[PDB]
Amino acid sequence: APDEITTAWPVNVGPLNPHLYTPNQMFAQSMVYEPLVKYQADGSVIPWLAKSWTHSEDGKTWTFTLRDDVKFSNGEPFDAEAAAENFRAVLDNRQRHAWLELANQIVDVKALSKTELQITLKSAYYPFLQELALPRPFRFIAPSQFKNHETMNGIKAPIGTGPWILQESKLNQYDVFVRNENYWGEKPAIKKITFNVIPDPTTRAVAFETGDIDLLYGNEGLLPLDTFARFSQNPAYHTQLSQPIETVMLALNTAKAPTNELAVREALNYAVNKKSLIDNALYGTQQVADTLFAPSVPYANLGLKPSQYDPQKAKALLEKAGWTLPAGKDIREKNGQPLRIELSFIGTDALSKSMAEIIQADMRQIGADVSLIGEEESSIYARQRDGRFGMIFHRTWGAPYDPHAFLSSMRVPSHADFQAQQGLADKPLIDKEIGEVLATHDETQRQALYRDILTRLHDEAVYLPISYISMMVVSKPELGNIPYAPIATEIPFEQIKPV
Numbered sequence: 001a002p003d004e005i006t007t008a009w010p011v012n013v014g015p016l017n018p019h020l021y022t023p024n025q026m027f028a029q030s031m032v033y034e035p036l037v038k039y040q041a042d043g044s045v046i047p048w049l050a051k052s053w054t055h056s057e058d059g060k061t062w063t064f065t066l067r068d069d070v071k072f073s074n075g076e077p078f079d080a081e082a083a084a085e086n087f088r089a090v091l092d093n094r095q096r097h098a099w100l101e102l103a104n105q106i107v108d109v110k111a112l113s114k115t116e117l118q119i120t121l122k123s124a125y126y127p128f129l130q131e132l133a134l135p136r137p138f139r140f141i142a143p144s145q146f147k148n149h150e151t152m153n154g155i156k157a158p159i160g161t162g163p164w165i166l167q168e169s170k171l172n173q174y175d176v177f178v179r180n181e182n183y184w185g186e187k188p189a190i191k192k193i194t195f196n197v198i199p200d201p202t203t204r205a206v207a208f209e210t211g212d213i214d215l216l217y218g219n220e221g222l223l224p225l226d227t228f229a230r231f232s233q234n235p236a237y238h239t240q241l242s243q244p245i246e247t248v249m250l251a252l253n254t255a256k257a258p259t260n261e262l263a264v265r266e267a268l269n270y271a272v273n274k275k276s277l278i279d280n281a282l283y284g285t286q287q288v289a290d291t292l293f294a295p296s297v298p299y300a301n302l303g304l305k306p307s308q309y310d311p312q313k314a315k316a317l318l319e320k321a322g323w324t325l326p327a328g329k330d331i332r333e334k335n336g337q338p339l340r341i342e343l344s345f346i347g348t349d350a351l352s353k354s355m356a357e358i359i360q361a362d363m364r365q366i367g368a369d370v371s372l373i374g375e376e377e378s379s380i381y382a383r384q385r386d387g388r389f390g391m392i393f394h395r396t397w398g399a400p401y402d403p404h405a406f407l408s409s410m411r412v413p414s415h416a417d418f419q420a421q422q423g424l425a426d427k428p429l430i431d432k433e434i435g436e437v438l439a440t441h442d443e444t445q446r447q448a449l450y451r452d453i454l455t456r457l458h459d460e461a462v463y464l465p466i467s468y469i470s471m472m473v474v475s476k477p478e479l480g481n482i483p484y485a486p487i488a489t490e491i492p493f494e495q496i497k498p499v
């Protein structure tokens, strides 16, 4: 059936609550729910659910003129009342969204007519419009699907305005989406998409070459990298790599020994032979990362010094910090205690598992004993949130989060950064300066603030940058060339065309 496609994903899409996080998958929230304004590859936004808008002299009050022709997928109208109700449900759970500064800025959301929605901020918050465009939390479920006039405690049906409708959800088996034939924009050419829930990356690969699935669209790590490289040589498949979009790095816990020592974290940054890891384990499909953000990230081309591969420097740094080698033993000890570190990652990620292996062996070469721990994604995120990790795999967030929303998130438990930074004496300063860089309209001062924040995080070796990864695609040749969505976690199913 040509206008239907089957694909695969490590987990289910989740309840598809538009205002909550994992277990909801962002690509799926974005299929069903839509923003007021839509993010573009060039960095701007365009009208979406909001046809047009104005704002006050001081920039604190924004009036949005909504379209009069949008319906939720069950036929109910999307209007200013519905959007206000959504914003109210979101901000009734405001603390959950404190990582994103817009959630701290919205004082009031008023419906003025059926088509006029007024949003009031406590300052002229320049990233306003980009954060409204994100996959979550500021997208719209029909108010009829609230539970007790809230969404923070669950939803009835995942009824959005978008071009896809969640039709069926079988746990640990599949999810099914059908086209919304009453979508207000372009009717997608695909009629139905089935997601098979396949957590093992080898089984996803086999699912593809048996022909059981048509497409794989995800981060590097959705397939074994050696399989993907062979797929790319096979004229019977089609494959793609986008330009790099995210950093993959380890967060090092400056709060827990032994990673709370600067000398230890610097040694670990010298320990990994990244050029070999990339050229070998990852098949040249990435680039060596020396900093938390790539030089191409806005405000991030700071000329920071890289830590290149230097086992001998690493050993010297450990010696001088009192981690020495007993006689006839490979693992350093200090004051009776061997140098042991725990390295946790999401088990279903082929890239994380594969890098964890190389990293472990590289760090043993300098006398550090690293234990690998692979777990379900919910357990890894909870670890990042509460500080229970030694070294934990991490990644930045792509456009448009990088750098401003990623930094904003460092100020509360979010991903691993807040907890990983608790050991830094200048952590409060960094957080103060993150708040300033999000508030300033002075271009010169905005660059100064980014440089200082990013140079402090670099100099104190909070991260072990590994590589800058790309989006990866595998598809039947019939689907032709697949486009990329400007937001890294979204999948542009509505632009795919059958033969």
Ligand SMILES: N[C@@H](CN[C@@H](CN[C@@H](CC(=O)O)C(=O)O)C(=O)O)C(=O)O
Binding pocket: 021, 022, 023, 099, 136, 381, 397, 409, 413, 414, 415, 489
């Ligand atoms: N992802 C974890 C924690 N999520 C963070 C916020 N991160 C953003 C961006 C991203 O993850 O690409 C988001 O998730 O929408 C928070 O809750 O502060 C979860 O689902 O809980």
Ligand code: NI
Binding pocket: 415
């Ligand atoms: Ni997140």
